[PDB]
Paper text:
The 26S proteasome unfolds and degrades hundreds of proteins to maintain proteostasis, regulate cellular processes and generate peptides with second messenger functions. It consists of a 20S core particle (CP) capped by one or two 19S regulatory particles (RPs) that gate access to the CP proteolytic chamber. The redox-active thioredoxin (TRX)-like protein TXNL1 is expressed in many cell types and was proposed as a nearly stoichiometric component of the human 26S proteasome. It uses its C-terminal PITH (proteasome-interacting TRX) domain for binding, while potentially reducing disulfide bonds with its N-terminal TRX domain but how it binds and is regulated remained unclear.
We initially focus on the most abundant and highest-resolution (~3 Å) state, PSRpt5. In PSRpt5, all five subunits from Rtp5 at the top to Rpt3 at the bottom of the staircase are substrate engaged through their pore 1 loop, while Rpt4 is the nonengaged seam subunit and at low resolution, likely because of continuous motion from the bottom to the top position. Extra density above Rpn11 could be unambiguously assigned to the PITH domain of TXNL1, which forms predominantly ionic contacts with Rpn2 and Rpn10’s VWA (von Willebrand factor type A) domain, explaining its salt sensitivity. The C-terminal tail of TXNL1 draped over Rpn11’s hydrophobic catalytic groove and the insert-1 (Ins-1) loop, which has important roles in binding the C terminus of ubiquitin and regulating access to the deubiquitination active site. TXNL1 interacts with the catalytic groove of Rpn11 through its hydrophobic tail residues F278 and M275. Interestingly, the C terminus of this tail reaches into Rpn11’s active site and uses a conserved terminal histidine to coordinate the catalytic Zn2+. The specific conformation and interactions of TXNL1’s C-terminal tail are compatible only with the closed state of Ins-1, whereas the ubiquitin-bound state would lead to steric clashes and the open state would be unable to form the necessary contacts. TXNL1’s tail may, thus, bind the catalytic groove of Rpn11 only on substrate-processing proteasomes when no deubiquitination is occurring. At the top of the staircase, Rpt5, Rpt1 and Rpt2 are ATP bound, whereas Rpt6, Rpt3 and Rpt4 at the bottom have ADP in their active sites.
Numbering used by the authors:
A (entry chain K): 5 to 127, 134 to 241
B (entry chain M): 5 to 244
C (entry chain I): 4 to 251
D (entry chain J): 2 to 240
E (entry chain A): 338 to 385
F (entry chain h): 1 to 206
G (entry chain F): 353 to 439
H (entry chain G): 6 to 244
The structure:
């Protein structure tokens, strides 16, 4: 592998590109992010992973407003995540401009994958970041997951980051098609607390929801305590 | 070892190894024989059907470079198809800029120069397919040129490219191509191809013929199925 | 190893190629410059002193860049020539756009930026030329600036680069009287430093080149000392050494 | 064998070249920055310049715009280029949009330039971590740190360069709302934080103090001397 | 004839290893072995 | 093409059941002078489509080389597919419209007609790119003189015969000769049917 | 001289060493020979034996071609997984 | 020493370019020999015509290429690269005629060829053309001229020469012959060239194994001697 | 330090551009060339030996003119010398066109040195393996400069490059006097070539050029024969 | 060996190993079966879900009204080739107003894939495409392997465990020609079901069916839409 894994342009005997998998491993080093899609809407819960009390909690961006109706969760390299998020915002604005309509979450995910796909197609390296896109569109609430390889697939409740395996295993057990937003949020917070090194409180998690009718609502300091109270 | 990793690195004894490797690659493919009639040029290639699911004509190795030029690539099929596209482009450009059909000699020379230009750079690799060009014109007779990966291309009375090139040449030298016509030469080509066939190492094959000469008003077209079977009948008559 | 190319960072975070160039700058001949209250000067050592070599330019190490600047050189010959040509181009371009002389530090920063760009972009070897700058500007007057292969310059009152730069710099620090040096005293100190900075004894006039910057009636005349005055200074230093040994 | 190319991912998904570049920031003079209610301070250590060299050309704290200033670490060659590009970007942003460049925007542009330089081979990463602080928010103080990698962060008080760990530890345990309630106490906090990293006398600390709707004020050695005298008096009171 | 590759344990393998080596240890009842497994990304059983 | 030098007369074509027929003059009139009088303005593209055009013969001649190579490539692949008369028409419409957009359009008013899969096609792409389908088409003046006549025959009876088509154009170009200052009494007739495309001529008038 | 078995050689080897085992008539030994490039005779016999053992794992009374491919994977210690980028 | 022979632009420790020498040696891969003899009023060159196959077309194998009606060339070495260089030489002659009017002298023609080869050898982009280019042609005011100019980029004036596998032996034979000053006549020049080739190759030189091309002052046009003329010259040579 | 003797764009630990030194060695391994500057003019001489009597000694000239008052002799790789001379001629004519004055020896030498250095800054381009020696007479003062692949240029009064350059330099400093004339300079140059010359010095084997106020001119075999007979 | 790094290096035996590895890249994906009757070209693909609660990955893509594909290989190269084929189809429609022939589009795909296998700068297109379409010459089922060589096949099958589908298609090739849409789809579904292990079964959530016919535009059937075809399939023995 040492001779075939030094470039996205080289094919391993399996045929595997031994550089995209390294990008996935890199995304494995980020803070855990969880997204649950329910009929009432889509919820995104993540881990702050605050490194110092001096740093401003709002400076580090895990859930961002790609558009008023689609939220994005970052897990991995900060630079690739920022570039992809800016490209998603630009693509959404371009679609609104040219077509006078809100681009579907599938369309925005496709646009972001397009940039995640030019990983050496002669107009660098794979974008080592996985983005969980959550929002409501003409088809209803939705959640889409993206990996550095550019593969995007609709997910009902996907967990990405350091605790992807355990969070996903518990989500499979705690997810059903008939969940409401409140119960989905409670379950997501419970799972994050289960897979969180530090005791859960209002300073280490940012929770985001996007329901039909309403816009991307990121729970504020007061709001987060109200939900963590019962869990 | 060491001097054979790039096509731009001359070997210590003075031989571009990548070109020889491409020649070996073309040698690793099936046979394709072009025999020049007294009044035309006949192409015959043993096209092995790798699986029974193919559509009896898929990935055919006989390509029409132009109206009067037939090409009988043998080797890496992707490189052969690319070479066919380049040959068609050169023929079209020659006709547009000069107004008359590009002579087989000039088309062969230009395509050979293009092929050789791909064995001089480190960023590109030599073509892994050897091709023969054939055409007929009353003004300039019938010409049969074979260009291999090395870029060399001089005319041939009859040539074979592929696994059994030597076996094909052994029984092609025993054919009088100087006087025969393009009617019995097709049967001779079918028989010679059928002789050069393992039949125990290669499961099966679909003989495909082609010709260009006076009998075809100077244009190169697939041999008619009515007479192609007759060639197949003669080949079957030949025990091998 | 981590010195295959300039762009490569060592694990400790060191541009190994840049450090290699800054070490190689020591092979160049000795040059030094002392800033004096009335002006600044440069001193260089002609390493090539073969009898068959004809001196046609007299400024192998000291070049004139502008009507109020001059910069000595130390390092590769081709790199030095390219750097001096770029310095002249930058100075004249600034003069054309702004119609006033470059304030010295601008030219130094431009050359340092060029060198930094070379040390950053891949496929280019660092400029192994460290050249001292002198000049006068309406903003700060006489200044002496040091440029390294890494593009890190810096104001200096007296520095020597090339052979035995460490000893020359140290003993300039030992005997440099801040704010009390005149051009004559500056030349005396420069000759004293050059005498022991080079192994060659007697400090032959043909083997040393001295240029001085003066501010005369608003003209900024750059003067390269002729062999006669260099010999006079050498004889003066010899007599001073004899007087000092008189105490023995 | 995965640390010889910027665009090569290690089996554990590490961009090793950027991590090595941060080591360059680890080798510079410490910079401490703490923002108050009406003041933003950028602490710095002087390196006791040579006896026979002028310190006017060793400026480490430079202002990108009329109200945004940055103190860097790492190699000066790259820091100068980053500063020049930041100045040009601020003057272009003002040109396109009359509104003065915000501290956030200048930090974002610096991060974008660093990322563009650390995205492909043939371009070495910028080995300088910049602390950009400014009242550009039109009534709100902001401080940012641009890592050599390309990511920036909002910091109430952060340290870069040699001793960054110790200065950060001191700042965390001493930066409270009561601490920065006034400009003088903010400056005293900066001096105290920089004292543990730089054990030396006067002129070894350069403090850049910027007040609301004002200009940069590089405190003269006397004022730093007055503040150090005050801090010594406070320590005497504690004992 | 058979070449068995003993790769680094996956998350389930690490959790099982943690339970196996912590069976005798007098540990508290709330120990989240899943978190300890996830905090040892690439560590063999010996490191566990 | 900003100032035509050698131009062409009208081009006429009327579609009948079983094929289509076109005809054109052979007078290349540089300005008002009959510069050339043995040129062909109707040549075939494939077995089931033929075209002829007015305007700069040089510009049209360029089109002849383009279509020939463009058409010749069709059979080189030997896949069976051949450019349908609409297929050539669609290429032509974008061909000239693309050229016009750059202020260098072909001052060559073409007409393309052919017989494909039991239906006749008669399209006309003007020197600028306009194109439509009509049972009978005439280029340049023919629209003024012969075109009005063809509606009368088609309006009362939209079905015509080869002989009815043959003389209809003759009564069409004949009136062209009388009331035109650029016509010539030597024209070819192009007939396209299941048997193929055949070109014959010239022909005179009384 | 003994060369590394060719395509026909590998197919024949698989046939010889798969004689004693209950083998599905649907096995395409030519495809296996293509899929086992750079395999010596001993490795081919190991491929056959591993295919048989894997078939035994599932409790399948008769071997299948996919079992032969999995044995080919196992012979070189390789493990095949559903990569998240090869869909 | 041996580690510097993998790139054409890398100098060997003793000051050598190994790739150029390797191309020179590759010149011999064709297994052929060519010789040129410059007579008093004629220039004659003879090269081997090997056809080791009954199915080859002997008319399409000729190595004597006519660059121009007044200038001639014989390519020895690799066939494809030799033909590419011949095409480039034809282009160069045509461009010289188009830009300066008068036909390009042979020396200039393959001096341009050799400059192309050298520019190839300096900038490491393409493998040097491994084919020696022997030029002949009558030049006004300078009589017959034969110039050999090779991959590395060296062109010289030659009274007689040869390139191919048997180059040293042929050149030694020519030196033994060129020294006894005598009437260098057309027949004498052709006879000496054929004799040198026969002795070097030690072959009876059947008429179908050699190909000759002669340019003369009386007829300053490249002419390829047919089989009959070659046979007549051979019979005259024997007796 | 064998690891850094390959690339021209990387610095060795000691700080040596290895490829430039290797190119200089290749230059020193070429044909001899000696030039002496006299108070009246300059002399340039190179030994022109062909490997056999079968080479037209007059076809290729080692001493070539760049302009009416500039010369060129080399020691090393001739094919590189051809491109060097072409660039020198282009530079001289560009200077003439821009300034309508024959390019001074100093400026032509500097621009040729710049051209040489242009090739020693990027991977994939081999340094010019020839060191040029430039004559000249501008402003009524004879000039002699040597441009090397490293790009450095000097003002040699008299030096010999190529094979046996140490012996040539030793011979110089002995038979060279600063107050000679053109004929004495020619004699000294011929002798210097002789002390590093293997075999008889025929008229066709030694090529010389005087470059006095009258301009640069390649002595024809007749004048070279006369001079050699006078010395012999 | 050491000839296993670049597509521009020739192995001593005469093989470009990188092309072989690109071809191997196909087998990492899900099995896909494409087959054509006289009037229809139906291709059935198996969809793999990364997690139990994640939508199954799209495998049958839409190119034009008369050209459908199945992607068995890299998602990146599969999507790039799909986009290029979409652009080619749109260009053919715009310039010719006629459906671009499936054979010509397949030839263009082969030509575009050949360049990455001949010049350093990008890896070979590691996606195996099963192009199904209807044109003037009837249905076409092509396969475009990464080696830049495409084969016109009656009923091809690529991807992991695809050998069983190929064997079944070889066995039942005869009936394919004279079969209706329902029988063609059922035979394709049987071919796919042969590839699956014993435990797994052809469920409505992991089968995608694409059909292009005489008067029917391309249709991609997913989820319930596959149910009408799936029902009635003989239970596997």
């Amino acid at each position: 592998r040492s001779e075939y894994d030094r470039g996205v342009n080289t094919f391993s005997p399996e045929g595997r590109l031994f550089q995209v998998e390294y990008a996935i491993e890199a995304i494995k080093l980020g803070s855990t992010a969880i997204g649950i899609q329910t009929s009432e809407g889509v919820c995104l819960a993540v881990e702050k992973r605050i490194t110092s009390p001096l740093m401003e909690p709002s400076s580090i961006e895990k859930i961002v407003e790609i558009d008023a109706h689609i939220g994005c969760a970052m897990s991995g390299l900060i630079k690739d995540a920022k570039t992809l998020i800016d490209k998603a915002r630009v693509e959404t604005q371009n679609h609104w401009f040219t077509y006078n309509e809100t681009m579907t979450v599938e369309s925005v995910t496709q646009a972001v994958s397009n940039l995640a796909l030019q990983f050496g197609e002669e107009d660098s390296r794979p974008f080592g970041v996985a983005l969980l896109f959550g929002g409501v569109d003409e088809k209803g609430p939705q959640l889409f997951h993206m990996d550095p390889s550019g593969t995007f697939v609709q997910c009902d409740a996907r967990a990405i980051g350091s605790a992807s395996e355990g969070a996903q295993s518990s989500l499979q057990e705690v997810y059903h098609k008939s969940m409401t937003l409140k119960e989905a949020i409670k379950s997501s917070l419970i799972i994050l607390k289960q897979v969180m090194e530090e005791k859960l409180n209002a300073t280490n998690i940012e929770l985001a929801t996007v329901q039909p009718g309403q816009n991307f609502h990121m729970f504020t300091k007061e709001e987060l305590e109200e939900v963590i109270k019962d869990i | 070892t060491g001097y054979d990793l790039s096509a731009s690195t001359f070997s210590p004894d003075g031989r571009v190894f990548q070109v020889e490797y491409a020649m070996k690659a073309v040698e690793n493919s099936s046979t394709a024989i072009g025999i020049r009639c007294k009044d035309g040029v006949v192409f015959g290639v043993e096209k092995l059907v790798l699986s029974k699911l193919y559509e009896e004509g898929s990935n055919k190795r006989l390509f029409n470079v132009d109206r009067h030029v037939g090409m009988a690539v043998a080797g890496l099929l992707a490189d052969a198809r690319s070479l066919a596209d380049i040959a068609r482009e050169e023929a079209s450009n020659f006709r547009s800029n000069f107004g008359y059909n590009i002579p087989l000699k000039h088309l062969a020379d230009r395509v050979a120069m293009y092929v050789h230009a791909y064995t001089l750079y480190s960023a590109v690799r030599p073509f892994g397919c050897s091709f023969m060009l054939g055409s007929y014109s009353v003004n300039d007779g019938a010409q049969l040129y074979m260009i291999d990966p090395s870029g060399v291309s001089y005319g041939y009375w009859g040539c074979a490219i592929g696994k059994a090139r030597q076996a094909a040449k052994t029984e092609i030298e025993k054919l009088q191509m100087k006087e025969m016509t393009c009617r019995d030469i097709v049967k001779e080509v079918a028989k010679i191809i059928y002789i050069v066939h393992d039949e125990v190492k290669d499961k099966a094959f679909e003989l495909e013929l082609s010709w260009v000469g006076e009998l075809t008003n100077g244009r190169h077209e697939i041999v008619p199925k009515d007479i192609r079977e007759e060639a197949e009948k003669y080949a079957k008559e030949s025990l091998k | 190893r981590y010195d295959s190319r300039t762009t490569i960072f060592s694990p400790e975070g060191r541009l190994y190629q840049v450090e290699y160039a800054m070490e190689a700058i020591g092979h160049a001949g000795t040059c030094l410059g002392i800033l004096a209250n009335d002006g600044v000067l440069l001193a260089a050592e002609r390493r090539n002193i073969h009898k068959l070599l004809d001196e046609v330019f007299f400024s192998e190490k000291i070049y004139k860049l502008n009507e109020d600047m001059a910069c000595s050189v130390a390092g590769i010959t081709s790199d030095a020539n390219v750097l001096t040509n770029e310095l002249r181009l930058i100075a004249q371009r600034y003069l054309l756009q702004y119609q006033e002389p470059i304030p010295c530090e601008q030219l130094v920063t431009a050359l340092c930026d060029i060198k930094q760009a070379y040390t950053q972009f891949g496929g280019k070897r660092p400029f192994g030329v460290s050249l001292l700058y002198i000049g006068w500007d309406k903003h700060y007057g006489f200044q002496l600036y040091q440029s390294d292969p890494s593009g890190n310059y810096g104001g200096w009152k007296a520095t020597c680069i090339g052979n035995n730069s460490a000893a020359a710099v140290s003993m300039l620090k030992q005997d440099y009287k801040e704010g009390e040096m005149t051009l004559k005293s500056a030349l005396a100190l420069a000759i004293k430093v050059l005498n022991k900075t080079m192994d060659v004894s007697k400090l032959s006039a043909e083997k040393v080149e001295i240029a001085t910057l003066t501010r005369e009636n608003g003209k900024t005349v750059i003067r390269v000392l002729k062999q006669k005055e260099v010999e006079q200074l050498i004889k003066k230093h010899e007599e001073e050494e004899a007087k000092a040994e008189r105490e023995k | 064998s995965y640390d010889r190319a910027i665009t090569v991912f290690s089996p554990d998904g590490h961009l090793f070249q950027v991590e090595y570049a941060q080591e360059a920031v680890k080798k510079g003079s410490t910079a401490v920055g703490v923002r108050g209610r009406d003041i933003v301070v950028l602490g710095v250590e002087k390196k006791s310049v040579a006896k026979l060299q002028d310190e006017r050309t060793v400026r480490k704290i430079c202002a990108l715009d009329d109200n945004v200033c940055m103190a860097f670490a790492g190699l000066t060659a790259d820091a100068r280029i980053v500063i020049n590009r930041a100045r040009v970007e601020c003057q272009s942003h003002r040109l396109t949009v009359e509104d003065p460049v915000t501290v956030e925007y200048i930090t974002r542009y610096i991060a974008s330039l660093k990322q563009r330089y650390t995205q492909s081979n043939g371009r070495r990463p910028f080995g300088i971590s910049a602390l950009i602080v400014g009242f550009d928010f039109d009534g709100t103080p902001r401080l940012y740190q641009t890592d050599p990698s390309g990511t920036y962060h909002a910091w109430k008080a952060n340290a870069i360069g040699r001793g960054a760990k110790s200065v950060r530890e001191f700042l965390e345990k001493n930066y409270t709302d009561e601490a920065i309630e006034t400009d003088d106490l903010t400056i005293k906090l900066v001096i105290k934080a920089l004292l543990e990293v730089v054990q030396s006398g006067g002129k070894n600390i350069e403090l850049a103090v910027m007040r609301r709707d004002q200009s940069l004020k590089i405190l003269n050695p006397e004022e730093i001397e007055k503040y150090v005298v005050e801090i010594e008096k406070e320590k005497e009171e504690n004992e | 004839d058979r070449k068995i590759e003993f790769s680094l344990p996956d998350l389930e393998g690490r959790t099982h290893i943690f339970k196996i080596h912590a069976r005798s240890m007098s540990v508290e009842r709330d120990i989240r072995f899943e978190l300890l497994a996830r905090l040892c990304p690439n560590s063999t059983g010996a490191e566990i | 093409t900003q100032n035509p030098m050698v131009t062409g007369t009208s081009v006429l074509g009327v579609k009948f059941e079983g094929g289509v027929v076109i005809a054109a003059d052979m007078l290349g009139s540089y300005g008002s002078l009959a510069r050339f009088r043995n040129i062909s303005r109707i040549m075939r593209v494939n077995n089931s489509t033929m075209l002829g055009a007015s305007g700069d013969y040089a510009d049209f001649q360029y089109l002849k080389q383009v279509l020939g190579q463009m058409v010749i490539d069709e059979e080189l692949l030997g896949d069976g597919h051949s450019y349908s008369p609409r297929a050539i028409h669609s290429w032509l419409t974008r061909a000239m419209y693309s050229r016009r957009s750059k202020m260098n359009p072909l001052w060559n008013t073409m007409v393309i007609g052919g017989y494909a899969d039991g239906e006749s096609f008669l399209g006309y792409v003007d020197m600028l790119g306009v194109a439509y389908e009509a049972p009978s088409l005439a280029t340049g003046y023919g629209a003024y003189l012969a075109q009005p006549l063809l509606r009368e025959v088609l309006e009362k009876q939209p079905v015509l015969s080869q002989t009815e088509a043959r003389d209809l154009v003759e009564r069409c170009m004949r009136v062209l000769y009388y009331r035109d200052a650029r016509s010539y009494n030597r024209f070819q007739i192009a007939t396209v049917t299941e048997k193929g495309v055949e070109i014959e001529g010239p022909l005179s008038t009384e | 001289e003994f060369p590394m078995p060719n395509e026909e050689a590998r197919a024949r080897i698989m046939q010889i060493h798969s004689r004693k085992m209950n083998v599905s008539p649907d096995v395409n030994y030519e495809e296996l020979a293509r899929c086992t490039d750079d395999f010596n005779g001993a490795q081919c016999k190991a491929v056959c034996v591993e295919a048989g053992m894997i078939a035994l794992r599932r409790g399948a009374t008769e071997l299948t071609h996919e079992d032969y491919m999995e044995g080919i994977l196992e012979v070189q210690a390789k493990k095949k997984a559903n990569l998240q980028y090869y869909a | 020493s041996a580690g510097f022979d993998r790139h054409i632009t890398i100098f060997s420790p003793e000051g050598r370019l190994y790739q150029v020498e390797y191309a020179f040696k590759a010149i011999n891969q064709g297994g052929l020999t060519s010789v040129a003899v410059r007579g008093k009023d004629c220039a004659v060159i003879v090269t081997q015509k090997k056809v080791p196959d009954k199915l080859l077309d002997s008319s399409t194998v000729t190595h004597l290429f006519k660059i121009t009606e007044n200038i001639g060339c014989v390519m020895t070495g690799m066939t494809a690269d030799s033909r590419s260089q011949v095409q480039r030489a034809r282009y160069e002659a045509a461009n010289w005629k188009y830009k300066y009017g008068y036909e390009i002298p042979v020396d200039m023609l393959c001096k341009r060829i050799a400059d192309i080869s050298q520019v190839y050898t300096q900038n490491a982009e393409m493998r040097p053309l491994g084919c020696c280019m022997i030029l002949i042609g009558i030049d006004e005011e300078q009589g017959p001229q034969v110039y050999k100019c090779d991959p590395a980029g060296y062109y010289c004036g030659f009274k007689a020469t040869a390139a191919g596998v048997k180059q040293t032996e042929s050149t030694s034979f020519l030196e033994k012959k060129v020294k006894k000053k005598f009437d260098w006549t057309f027949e004498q020049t052709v006879e000496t060239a054929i004799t040198c080739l026969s002795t070097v190759l030690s072959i009876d030189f059947k008429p179908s194994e050699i190909e000759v091309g002669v340019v003369t002052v009386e007829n300053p046009k490249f002419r390829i001697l047919t089989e009959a003329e070659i046979d007549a010259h051979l019979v005259a040579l024997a007796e | 330090e064998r690891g850094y003797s390959f690339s021209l764009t990387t610095f060795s630990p000691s700080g040596k551009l290895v490829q430039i030194e290797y190119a200089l060695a290749a230059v020193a391994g070429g044909a001899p060339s000696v030039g002496i500057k006299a108070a009246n003019g300059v002399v340039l001489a190179t030994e022109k030996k062909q490997k056999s009597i079968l080479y037209d000694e007059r076809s290729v000239h080692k001493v070539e003119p760049i302009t009416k008052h500039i010369g060129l002799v080399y020691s090393g790789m001739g094919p590189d010398y051809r491109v060097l001379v072409h660039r020198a001629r282009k530079l001289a004519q560009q200077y003439y066109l821009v300034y309508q004055e024959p390019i001074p020896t100093a400026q032509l030498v500097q621009r040729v040195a710049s051209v040489m250095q242009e090739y020693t800054q990027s991977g994939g381009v081999r340094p010019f393996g020839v060191s040029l020696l430039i004559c000249g007479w501008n402003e009524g003062r004879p000039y002699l400069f040597q441009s090397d692949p490293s790009g450095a240029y000097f003002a040699w009064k008299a030096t010999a490059m190529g094979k046996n350059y140490v012996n040539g330099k030793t011979f110089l400093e002995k038979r060279y006097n600063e107050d000679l004339e053109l004929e004495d300079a020619i004699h000294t140059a011929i002798l210097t070539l002789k002390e590093s010359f293997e075999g008889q010095m025929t008229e066709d084997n030694i090529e010389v050029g005087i470059c006095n106020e009258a301009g640069f001119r390649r002595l024809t075999p007749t004048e070279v024969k006369d001079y050699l007979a006078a010395i012999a | 060996n050491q000839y296993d790094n670049d597509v521009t290096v020739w192995s001593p035996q005469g093989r470009i190993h990188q092309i072989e590895y690109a071809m191997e890249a196909v087998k990492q994906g899900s099995a896909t079966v494409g087959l054509k009757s006289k009037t229809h070209a139906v291709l059935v693909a198996l969809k793999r879900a990364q997690s139990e609660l994640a939508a199954h990955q799209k495998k049958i893509l839409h190119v034009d009204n008369h050209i459908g594909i199945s992607i068995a290989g890299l998602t990146a190269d599969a999507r790039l080739l799909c986009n290029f084929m979409r652009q080619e189809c749109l260009d053919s429609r715009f310039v010719f107003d006629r459906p671009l022939p499936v054979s010509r589009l397949v030839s263009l795909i082969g030509s575009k894939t050949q360049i990455p296998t001949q010049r350093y700068g990008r890896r070979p297109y590691g996606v195996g495409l099963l192009i199904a379409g209807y044109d003037d010459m009837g249905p076409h089922i092509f396969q475009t392997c990464p080696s830049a060589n495409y084969f016109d096949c009656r009923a091809m099958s690529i991807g992991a465990r695809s050998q069983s589908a190929r064997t079944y298609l070889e066995r039942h090739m005869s009936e394919f020609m004279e079969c209706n849409l329902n029988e063609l789809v059922k035979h394709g579904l049987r071919a796919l079901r042969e590839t699956l292990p014993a435990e797994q079964d052809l469920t409505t959530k992991n089968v995608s069916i694409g059909i292009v016919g005489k008067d029917l535009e391309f249709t991609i059937y997913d989820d319930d839409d596959v149910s009408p075809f799936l029902e009635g399939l003989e239970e596997r023995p």
